[PDB]
Protein backbone atom coordinates (compact mmCIF):
# COMPACT_ATOMS: atom_id res chain seq x y z
CA UNK A 1 0.00 0.00 0.00
CA UNK A 2 1.13 3.52 -0.92
CA UNK A 3 -0.68 6.65 0.24
CA UNK A 4 0.30 10.30 0.47
CA UNK A 5 -1.14 13.76 0.99
CA UNK A 6 0.04 16.80 -0.93
CA UNK A 7 0.41 20.56 -0.94
CA UNK A 8 -0.14 22.41 -4.22
CA UNK A 9 1.00 26.01 -4.43
CA UNK A 10 1.16 28.91 -1.99
CA UNK A 11 -0.41 32.18 -3.09
CA UNK A 12 -0.19 35.65 -1.56
CA UNK A 13 -1.30 39.20 -2.06
CA UNK A 14 0.98 42.15 -2.72
CA UNK A 15 0.10 45.25 -0.72
CA UNK A 16 0.28 48.17 -3.12
CA UNK A 17 2.52 50.87 -1.67
CA UNK A 18 0.64 54.07 -2.46
CA UNK A 19 2.52 57.34 -2.46
CA UNK A 20 0.01 60.14 -1.93
CA UNK A 21 1.48 62.08 -4.85
CA UNK A 22 0.70 59.15 -7.15
CA UNK A 23 -2.82 60.55 -6.85
CA UNK A 24 -3.86 63.69 -8.65
CA UNK A 25 -6.15 64.65 -5.82
CA UNK A 26 -2.98 66.18 -4.36
CA UNK A 27 -3.49 69.02 -6.83
CA UNK A 28 -6.12 70.26 -4.35
CA UNK A 29 -3.57 70.92 -1.60
CA UNK A 30 -0.07 72.23 -1.04
CA UNK A 31 1.21 69.47 1.24
CA UNK A 32 4.37 70.57 3.05
CA UNK A 33 6.12 68.92 5.98
CA UNK A 34 6.55 70.15 9.51
CA UNK A 35 9.22 68.31 11.46
CA UNK A 36 7.49 69.84 14.50
CA UNK A 37 3.77 70.52 14.82
CA UNK A 38 2.91 69.23 18.28
CA UNK A 39 4.93 71.89 20.09
CA UNK A 40 3.29 74.76 18.21
CA UNK A 41 0.48 76.62 19.99
CA UNK A 42 -0.28 79.49 17.59
CA UNK A 43 -1.67 78.45 14.24
CA UNK A 44 -2.59 81.71 12.51
CA UNK A 45 -1.94 82.57 8.85
CA UNK A 46 -2.00 86.16 7.61
CA UNK A 47 -4.22 86.87 4.60
CA UNK A 48 -3.81 90.10 2.61
CA UNK A 49 -6.92 91.01 0.62
Amino acid sequence: DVEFDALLGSYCNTLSLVRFLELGLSVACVCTKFPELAYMNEGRVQFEV
Binding site: N13, L15, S16
Partner: protein, 49 residues
Protein backbone atom coordinates in the same frame (compact mmCIF):
# COMPACT_ATOMS: atom_id res chain seq x y z
CA UNK B 1 -3.16 40.61 3.50
CA UNK B 2 -5.49 43.55 4.05
CA UNK B 3 -4.34 47.13 3.57
CA UNK B 4 -5.15 49.80 6.14
CA UNK B 5 -5.91 53.50 6.21
CA UNK B 6 -5.37 55.56 9.37
CA UNK B 7 -8.22 57.52 10.94
CA UNK B 8 -8.54 59.90 13.87
CA UNK B 9 -10.80 59.62 16.88
CA UNK B 10 -13.23 59.23 18.48
CA UNK B 11 -14.03 55.91 16.82
CA UNK B 12 -11.30 53.41 17.50
CA UNK B 13 -7.96 52.34 16.08
CA UNK B 14 -7.55 49.32 13.80
CA UNK B 15 -4.63 46.82 13.64
CA UNK B 16 -3.39 44.96 10.55
CA UNK B 17 -5.40 41.82 9.91
CA UNK B 18 -4.27 38.70 8.10
CA UNK B 19 -6.08 35.76 6.54
CA UNK B 20 -4.95 32.21 5.80
CA UNK B 21 -7.19 30.10 3.57
CA UNK B 22 -7.18 26.35 2.92
CA UNK B 23 -9.14 24.73 0.09
CA UNK B 24 -9.46 20.99 -0.48
CA UNK B 25 -9.21 19.44 -3.95
CA UNK B 26 -12.56 18.24 -5.26
CA UNK B 27 -12.01 15.02 -7.19
CA UNK B 28 -13.94 13.44 -10.07
CA UNK B 29 -13.48 10.79 -12.75
CA UNK B 30 -14.68 9.92 -16.26
CA UNK B 31 -15.76 6.86 -18.22
CA UNK B 32 -15.82 5.57 -21.80
CA UNK B 33 -17.05 2.41 -23.53
CA UNK B 34 -14.80 0.93 -26.22
CA UNK B 35 -16.33 -2.54 -26.53
CA UNK B 36 -15.36 -4.94 -29.32
CA UNK B 37 -17.17 -7.93 -30.82
CA UNK B 38 -16.83 -11.71 -30.88
CA UNK B 39 -14.78 -12.42 -34.02
CA UNK B 40 -12.66 -9.26 -33.77
CA UNK B 41 -10.36 -10.80 -31.16
CA UNK B 42 -9.53 -13.75 -33.42
CA UNK B 43 -9.21 -11.43 -36.43
CA UNK B 44 -6.54 -9.51 -34.52
CA UNK B 45 -4.94 -12.51 -32.82
CA UNK B 46 -4.62 -14.71 -35.90
CA UNK B 47 -6.95 -17.65 -35.29
CA UNK B 48 -8.92 -17.07 -38.49
CA UNK B 49 -5.89 -16.12 -40.59
Amino acid sequence: HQPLIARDGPHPIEQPTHNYMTKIIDRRALNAAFSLATEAIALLTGEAL
